[PDB]
Design a protein around this ligand. Sequence first.
Ligand SMILES: CN[C@H]1[C@@H](O[C@@H]2/C3=C/C#C[C@H]4O[C@@]4([C@H]4COC(=O)O4)C#CC3=C[C@H]2OC(=O)c2c(O)ccc3c(C)cc(OC)cc23)O[C@H](C)[C@H](O)[C@@H]1O
Length: 113
Amino acid sequence: AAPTATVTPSSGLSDGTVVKVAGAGLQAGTAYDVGQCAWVDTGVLACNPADFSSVTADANGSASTSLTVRRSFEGFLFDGTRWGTVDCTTAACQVGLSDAAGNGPEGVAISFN
Ligand SMILES: CN[C@H]1[C@@H](O[C@@H]2/C3=C/C#C[C@H]4O[C@@]4([C@H]4COC(=O)O4)C#CC3=C[C@H]2OC(=O)c2c(O)ccc3c(C)cc(OC)cc23)O[C@H](C)[C@H](O)[C@@H]1O
């Protein structure tokens, strides 16, 4: 089984709901993180600490956890600085997983009606 991730709902969340992101086939033995982060530029990742979960890829590496994600969301910049409230109505925020080496599986693009 190859790595992947089932996240849902991807849209119709509304400010204050919870989405369920999952991973399957990830590095079987690598603690991956799981949350809502948006790329607003070349190497700019503003994530929100309200969906920051984490689990290690077990035998195959399945990780399913629910978290709260909305349109505007803390733009935590991976550099100690904060980018500001990242309005998901401007950029595309994906719900995905990752590890602490440099990168990991991808994220699912959510939508806000
Ligand atoms: C290994 N580090 C690289 C990685 O960093 C990601 C990252 C971004 C950020 C931020 C700040 O909130 C903090 C802390 C760290 O310092 C602070 O001040 O706050 C964190 C973290 C992170 C954890 C990593 O998650 C991921 O790896 C990740 C990803 O690469 C792509 C999509 C992801 C998605 C969609 C979700 C997700 O769940 C967490 C993780 C990822 O991608 C950045 C673009 C840079 O290249 C970084 O050098």
